[PDB]
């Protein structure tokens, strides 16, 4: 039961900085963006039911 290895993986993981991005809207505007993307935009869906984060 050696405690020598503790935080080894969090220690040896390469440190990648967070990229600077445009701030996201909040409140009613974020909900409006969600509603427009999911119910007003019909182009992406031809009827195959793909997930919003499908990267394949």
């Amino acid at each position: 039961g050696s405690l020598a290895r503790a935080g080894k993986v969090r220690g040896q993981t390469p440190k990648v900085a967070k990229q600077e991005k445009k701030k996201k809207k909040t409140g009613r505007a974020k909900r409006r963006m969600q509603y427009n993307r999911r119910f007003v935009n019909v182009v992406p869906t031809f009827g195959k039911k793909k997930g919003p984060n499908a990267n394949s």
């Binding site: 505007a29 909900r31 409006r32």
Partner: protein, 180 residues
């Protein structure tokens, strides 16, 4: 001993199942249609409608010629007709159970401001109300959830101190005209 009052009441109820697709899609449809801020406004209108339906049901269980049923049923029907969610022609307890959540969301000041042409969109209506550009009768109303009555429907004006219905230019216009 204090001279205060602790009578408070939560105005909504959280759904039993946090993640079900049909409810999420329907509530997002409602938010997008009526320009609401979060799911809590949908749940608040849902809670109002559910309380109304519960009262109507408990009245409908009573005797038809029951004095309490008659009195409270007429009171509830008058309250629903007054805000314009129920037609005056169909004023019976059984027509209450036919009401939907959208009948109540149509009576918000946001919806009435967008529908009367005072705003370009429902979100423009919300920001117009929140920015003190709208008055109902002679009173400036600042709450988008203001449930407009039937008698105050024709009195939603564009205020008198706002540049849109008043005539004093705002901060930005004054500053930019001052740079001419």
């Amino acid at each position: 001993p204090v001279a205060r009052s602790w009578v408070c009441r939560k105005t909504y109820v959280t759904p039993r199942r946090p993640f079900e697709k049909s409810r999420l899609d329907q509530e997002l449809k409602l938010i997008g249609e009526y320009g609401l801020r979060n799911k809590r406004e949908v749940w608040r209108v849902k809670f109002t409608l559910a309380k109304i339906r519960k009262a109507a049901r408990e009245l409908l269980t009573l005797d038809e010629k029951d004095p309490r049923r008659l009195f409270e049923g007429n009171a509830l029907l008058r309250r629903l007709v007054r805000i314009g969610v129920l037609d005056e022609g169909k004023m019976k307890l059984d027509y209450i159970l036919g009401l939907k959540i959208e009948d109540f969301l149509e009576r918000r000041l946001q919806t009435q401001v967008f529908k009367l042409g005072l705003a370009k969109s429902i979100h423009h209506a919300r920001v117009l109300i929140r920015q003190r550009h709208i008055r109902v009768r002679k009173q400036v109303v600042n709450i988008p959830s203001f449930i407009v009555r039937l008698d105050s429907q024709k009195h939603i004006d564009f205020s008198l101190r706002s540049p849109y219905g008043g005539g004093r230019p705002g901060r930005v216009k004054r500053k930019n005209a001052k740079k001419g």
